[PDB]
Amino acid sequence: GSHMYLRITNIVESSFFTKFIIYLIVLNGITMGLETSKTFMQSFGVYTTLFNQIVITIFTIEIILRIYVHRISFFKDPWSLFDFFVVAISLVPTSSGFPILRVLRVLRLFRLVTAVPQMRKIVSALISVIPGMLSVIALMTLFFYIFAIMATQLFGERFPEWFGTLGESFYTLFQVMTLESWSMGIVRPLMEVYPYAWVFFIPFIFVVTFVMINLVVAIIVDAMAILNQKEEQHIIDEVQ
Amino acid sequence: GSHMYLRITNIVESSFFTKFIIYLIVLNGITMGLETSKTFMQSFGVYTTLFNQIVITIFTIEIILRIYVHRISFFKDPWSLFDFFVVAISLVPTSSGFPILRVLRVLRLFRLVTAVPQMRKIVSALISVIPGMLSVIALMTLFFYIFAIMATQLFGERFPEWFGTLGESFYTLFQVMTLESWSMGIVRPLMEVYPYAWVFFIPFIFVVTFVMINLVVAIIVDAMAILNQKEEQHIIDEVQ
Amino acid sequence: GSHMYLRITNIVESSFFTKFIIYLIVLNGITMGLETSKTFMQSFGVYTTLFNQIVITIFTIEIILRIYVHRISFFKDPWSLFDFFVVAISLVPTSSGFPILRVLRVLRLFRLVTAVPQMRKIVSALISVIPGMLSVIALMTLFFYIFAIMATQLFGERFPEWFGTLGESFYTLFQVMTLESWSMGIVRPLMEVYPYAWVFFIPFIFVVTFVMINLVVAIIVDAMAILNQKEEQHIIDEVQ
Amino acid sequence: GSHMYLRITNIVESSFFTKFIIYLIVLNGITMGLETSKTFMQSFGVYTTLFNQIVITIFTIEIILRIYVHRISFFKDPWSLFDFFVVAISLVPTSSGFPILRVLRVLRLFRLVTAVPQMRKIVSALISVIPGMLSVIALMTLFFYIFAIMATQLFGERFPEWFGTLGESFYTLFQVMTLESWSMGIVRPLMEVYPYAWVFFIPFIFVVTFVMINLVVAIIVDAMAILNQKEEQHIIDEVQ
Ligand SMILES: CCCCCCCCCCCCCC(=O)OC[C@H](COP(=O)(O)OCC[N+](C)(C)C)OC(=O)CCCCCCCCCCCCC
Ligand SMILES: CCCCCCCCCCCCCC(=O)OC[C@H](COP(=O)(O)OCC[N+](C)(C)C)OC(=O)CCCCCCCCCCCCC
Ligand SMILES: CCCCCCCCCCCCCC(=O)OC[C@H](COP(=O)(O)OCC[N+](C)(C)C)OC(=O)CCCCCCCCCCCCC
Numbered sequence: 028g029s030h031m032y033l034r035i036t037n038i039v040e041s042s043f044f045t046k047f048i049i050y051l052i053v054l055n056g057i058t059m060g061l062e063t064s065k066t067f068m069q070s071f072g073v074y075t076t077l078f079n080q081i082v083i084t085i086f087t088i089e090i091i092l093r094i095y096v097h098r099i100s101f102f103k104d105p106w107s108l109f110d111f112f113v114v115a116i117s118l119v120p121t122s123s124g125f126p127i128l129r130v131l132r133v134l135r136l137f138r139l140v141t142a143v144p145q146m147r148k149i150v151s152a153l154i155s156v157i158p159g160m161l162s163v164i165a166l167m168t169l170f171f172y173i174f175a176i177m178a179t180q181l182f183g184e185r186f187p188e189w190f191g192t193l194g195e196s197f198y199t200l201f202q203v204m205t206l207e208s209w210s211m212g213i214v215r216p217l218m219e220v221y222p223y224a225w226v227f228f229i230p231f232i233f234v235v236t237f238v239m240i241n242l243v244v245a246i247i248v249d250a251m252a253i254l255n256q257k258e259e260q261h262i263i264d265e266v267q
Numbered sequence: 268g269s270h271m272y273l274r275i276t277n278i279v280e281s282s283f284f285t286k287f288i289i290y291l292i293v294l295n296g297i298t299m300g301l302e303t304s305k306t307f308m309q310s311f312g313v314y315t316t317l318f319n320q321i322v323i324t325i326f327t328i329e330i331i332l333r334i335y336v337h338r339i340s341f342f343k344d345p346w347s348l349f350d351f352f353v354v355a356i357s358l359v360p361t362s363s364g365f366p367i368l369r370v371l372r373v374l375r376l377f378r379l380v381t382a383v384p385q386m387r388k389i390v391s392a393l394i395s396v397i398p399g400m401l402s403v404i405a406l407m408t409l410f411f412y413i414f415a416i417m418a419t420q421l422f423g424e425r426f427p428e429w430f431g432t433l434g435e436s437f438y439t440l441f442q443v444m445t446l447e448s449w450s451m452g453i454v455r456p457l458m459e460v461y462p463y464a465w466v467f468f469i470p471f472i473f474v475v476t477f478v479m480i481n482l483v484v485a486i487i488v489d490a491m492a493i494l495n496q497k498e499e500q501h502i503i504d505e506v507q
Numbered sequence: 508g509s510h511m512y513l514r515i516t517n518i519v520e521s522s523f524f525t526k527f528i529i530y531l532i533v534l535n536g537i538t539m540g541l542e543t544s545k546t547f548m549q550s551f552g553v554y555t556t557l558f559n560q561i562v563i564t565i566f567t568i569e570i571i572l573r574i575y576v577h578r579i580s581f582f583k584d585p586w587s588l589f590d591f592f593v594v595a596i597s598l599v600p601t602s603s604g605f606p607i608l609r610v611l612r613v614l615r616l617f618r619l620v621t622a623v624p625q626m627r628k629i630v631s632a633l634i635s636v637i638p639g640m641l642s643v644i645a646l647m648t649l650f651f652y653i654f655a656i657m658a659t660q661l662f663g664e665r666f667p668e669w670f671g672t673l674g675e676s677f678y679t680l681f682q683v684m685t686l687e688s689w690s691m692g693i694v695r696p697l698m699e700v701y702p703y704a705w706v707f708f709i710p711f712i713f714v715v716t717f718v719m720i721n722l723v724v725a726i727i728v729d730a731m732a733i734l735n736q737k738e739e740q741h742i743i744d745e746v747q
Numbered sequence: 748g749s750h751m752y753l754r755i756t757n758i759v760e761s762s763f764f765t766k767f768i769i770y771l772i773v774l775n776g777i778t779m780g781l782e783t784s785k786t787f788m789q790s791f792g793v794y795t796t797l798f799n800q801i802v803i804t805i806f807t808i809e810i811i812l813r814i815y816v817h818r819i820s821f822f823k824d825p826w827s828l829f830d831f832f833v834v835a836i837s838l839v840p841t842s843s844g845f846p847i848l849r850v851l852r853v854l855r856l857f858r859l860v861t862a863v864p865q866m867r868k869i870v871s872a873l874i875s876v877i878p879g880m881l882s883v884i885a886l887m888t889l890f891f892y893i894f895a896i897m898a899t900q901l902f903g904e905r906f907p908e909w910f911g912t913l914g915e916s917f918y919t920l921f922q923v924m925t926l927e928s929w930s931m932g933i934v935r936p937l938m939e940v941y942p943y944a945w946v947f948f949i950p951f952i953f954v955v956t957f958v959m960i961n962l963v964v965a966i967i968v969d970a971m972a973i974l975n976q977k978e979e980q981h982i983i984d985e986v987q
């Protein structure tokens with residue numbers, strides 16, 4: 028709370044500021060989708076690479092300004108910590124070799140979430156249910172890891188593409204979970220060498236599906252014992 | 268409100284009128300399904316092409332009559348705006364070349380919805396939930412568009428059939444969303460050139476599915492906080 | 508209500524009677540599953556064909572007895588009308604040529620439903636929800652029939668195996684509904700001749716899925732406005 | 748209740764005891780996942796086979812101790828009966844030939860459930876709903892067994908890989924239930940010999956899916972007539 032600090036704060040917390048940031052994001056969005064076309068990039072190539080690092084600096088300025096305003100509440104606000112990390116990624120130069128970092132630039136279009144509250148509310152409601160599932164996710168991951176071990180010991184010999192490695196089984200088992208060609212592509216070929224592989228996979232499909240179903244039925248039915256107690260006491264409220 | 272206007276209005280708003288329109292629709296339905304057979308079309312070919320443009324004019328007459336009756340309320344009633352556009356399509360002649368317009372004729376069997384209230388009510392209940400999802404659809408589309416860009420930059424070089432174009436990635440990613448041969452057909456071939464493509468697609472499958480599930484759980488659980496407040500206040504109603 | 512009529516009725520409505528019928532059904536079940544094996548059928552072949560027509564006559568006797576008891580209430584009780592038709596099928600001899608009728612014999616194992624009330628209750632609860640869906644099924648079938656026509660006109664020329672016939676499109680479209688290899692197997696081959704077939708199928712997948720989801724959300728949420736009014740009035744019951 | 752019995756009981760029922768057991772389980776978990784790598788097993792091979800039978804004896808000791816404490820309540824506590832059977836499996840030596848028993852060792856990582864109450868509660872909630880489904884599972888299994896018989900009689904001749912055996916049809920039908928390449932892989936090849944096989948499988952897909960959906964809708968809606976009566980009477984509670 029000072030002279031220039033508060034002058035800054037009026038700009039950062041302003042309508043024009045976020046409007047402009049969003050306005051820029053949508054442009055850099057169309058910019059980055061047009062960068063897809065070599066027809067475009069052959070012609071108007073530099074027009075966009077410049078436009079990008081114009082926007083990167085603006086976003087860096089904007090992040091710096093928001094830090095001076097928000098102090099510690101910036102590095103505990105997830106939506107800002109995202110904007111920090113998602114813009115810092117775009118500041119690591121292409122001079123560092125690793126080819127994907129020039130592609131991680133595009134994640135800065137996710138600012139359209141953190142800077143638009145309609146999206147922020149949806150995103151929050153989806154993350155809101157994850158912590159209740161963290162213990163069901165835990166059992167599933169242990170389930171996968173136990174069956175990843177067994178499959179790597181049972182099938183990775185005669186089938187190394189699918190099971191020769193704990194990870195290759197993890198991927199394959201996750202594909203069995205999606206039911207993606209689990210039978211025609213995996214178990215039926217496995218069965219023409221190991222006749223009983225169906226004893227492994229048919230129960231695995233049963234458990235990992237039946238659990239996924241109860242994960243949802245838990246979410247719904249347990250969400251609505253609350254609406255049936257928040258109502259109950261507010262009906263017991265008005266009966267004395 | 269006049270002499271002939273009101274004479275017309277009794278016909279348009281009548282039971283016989285809609286009954287006849289529906290009666291015609293069902294016939295032109297069987298007409299258009301029999302037009303499938305060359306055995307039929309070789310024999311009774313003209314019997315149907317005539318029958319069609321008999322029905323088209325009747326439907327044009329009927330649309331004209333309904334406009335004189337309903338005035339502005341016809342061009343704000345969606346069910347009529349449909350009948351308008353769906354019959355106007357059938358009036359663009361096959362003399363205009365574009366081959367599909369002779370196939371868009373069949374959409375005039377969707378009149379059986381707009382002209383039968385039992386269907387109109389179902390259709391209304393399905394469209395009724397879309398506006399609540401428009402913001403979740405928005406995030407998904409941005410999600411797709413961000414990952415469509417990245418995939419087109421990561422894989423369209425060595426895999427142009429699947430990712431060489433922002434649209435080809437959009438289609439492919441939508442196929443990954445359906446889980447349609449996402450692993451055997453796409454990611455496993457991708458991995459034999461790009462070993463880490465699973466880091467791209469396994470999370471994409473996670474997010475785009477987990478969101479689709481919460482879209483439904485939102486629809487159900489939020490629909491029924493209303494039945495638990497419309498009930499609550501009607502229980503608080505009768506306790507004073 | 509007589510002398511022999513009532514003597515009969517004590518047997519038909521008895522515990523031993525249904526117990527024996529069920530006891531027989533389970534045996535003819537194992538009989539018919541062992542008829543699968545040629546190893547068995549080569550050895551104990553006649554032991555079962557006899558056993559079957561022993562049970563068929565018993566079931567015919569039992570149906571005749573139940574008709575004399577139940578009079579008109581037998582030909583309006585669905586569970587009996589089933590037992591009637593499902594045993595009458597087993598009485599059409601193999602002397603009539605049509606090869607499948609000797610296989611329709613097996614449907615007489617569905618008696619284990621109609622004769623065991625625990626199953627009858629489940630079956631009733633599943634059929635119970637069908638009549639509410641009959642109008643949503645109606646729209647879907649019209650939707651399929653409209654898009655079956657269009658696809659047969661758009662693709663059956665260059666793709667007769669999938670679309671050359673209104674039925675072949677019906678089957679294919681139902682396979683697109685199941686998402687069974689809809690892209691790799693169907694639309695992607697279609698697109699290498701008709702580049703815009705994705706404009707046909709991607710919306711078709713959208714509608715026919717989005718409707719299937721709302722069919723369930725309708726079932727759940729509407730079932731439980733009843734439990735929230737049967738409760739409400741029974742709470743308004745006790746507040747005067 | 749004695750001198751040494753109660754000395755033992757303080758150790759078994761202690762925090763350190765279960766903490767140590769869990770601490771060991773997590774190590775033997777990483778041990779067994781590293782046993783996947785031949786690079787590891789070539790080098791530090793004996794380091795783990797020893798470590799395993801160190802843990803097996805500790806778990807045997809621990810099971811023996813828990814039996815002396817818990818007496819009959821150990822052989823009626825499912826979580827212990829599991830630990831008993833899951834460790835007894837690891838005590839059958841590899842000297843008995845059957846190759847899989849050395850792989851069933853890994854199931855002793857499921858102790859991390861029975862020994863961690865956060866997991867035990869989830870597991871209990873998932874098993875909790877199974878007994879309500881036991882009668883719906885029963886009908887499905889009879890449904891499968893009836894259609895497994897018919898398919899083995901209809902298709903196992905010209906298609907022995909898929910239907911030549913009651914079990915091969917069971918597996919195939921379960922794959923049709925998963926919708927795993929049911930059309931492209933199974934029914935479409937069947938139809939190019941048996942043109943009407945779609946009359947078999949399209950209804951089978953209908954029934955076995957429609958039932959699976961009602962299984963869930965039953966679980967949800969019936970779970971919440973209870974929350975709407977446990978609430979109702981607790982609202983009728985406070986209105987006298
Ligand atoms: C209701 C619950 C729903 C979620 C259930 C989750 C079950 C467990 C995760 C399964 C996901 C499958 C992951 C997967 O693709 O595994 C591959 C990796 C890497 O192995 P790698 O050998 O590098 O890749 C094989 C392919 N290759 C050779 C061409 C590179 O394999 C590994 O390295 C092991 C992966 C273990 C993942 C554990 C992550 C932390 C806990 C789970 C968090 C999940 C997201 C919320
Ligand atoms: C819970 C949410 C569920 C819905 C999630 C929706 C996610 C976003 C839409 C994904 C649907 C996939 C669309 C698709 O097939 O994309 C293809 C098009 C055209 O690209 P194009 O390169 O012409 O086609 C490739 C194939 N080829 C070369 C043989 C012609 O690609 C494009 O041109 C871009 C398509 C962008 C669609 C944006 C439409 C407006 C917003 C989304 C509305 C969705 C329906 C309610
Ligand atoms: C939420 C709703 C879920 C249910 C949505 C149902 C949508 C409509 C039914 C779709 C089911 C697909 C039926 C199907 O496989 O169609 C094939 C038939 C026969 O055509 P056909 O050309 O004989 O068979 C082609 C294959 N071939 C040449 C090797 C014999 O094609 C036909 O002949 C036309 C079939 C029209 C079926 C209309 C049946 C009455 C109304 C729907 C009742 C559905 C069950 C409750």
Ligand SMILES: CCCCCCCCCCCCCC(=O)OC[C@H](COP(=O)(O)OCC[N+](C)(C)C)OC(=O)CCCCCCCCCCCCC
Pocket residue numbers: 218219222223225229233883884887888891912913914915917918921958959962
């Ligand atoms: C809403 C309900 C959801 C659950 C629905 C369950 C429907 C019935 C079970 C279907 C599961 C499919 C089982 C399966 O893979 O069957 C194969 C077995 C063994 O036949 P087999 O000929 O040995 O294996 C064929 C493959 N080969 C030649 C390479 C070895 O086939 C048999 O031997 C017969 C299997 C009968 C299983 C009956 C088990 C007891 C009742 C069901 C319990 C299910 C788990 C809770």
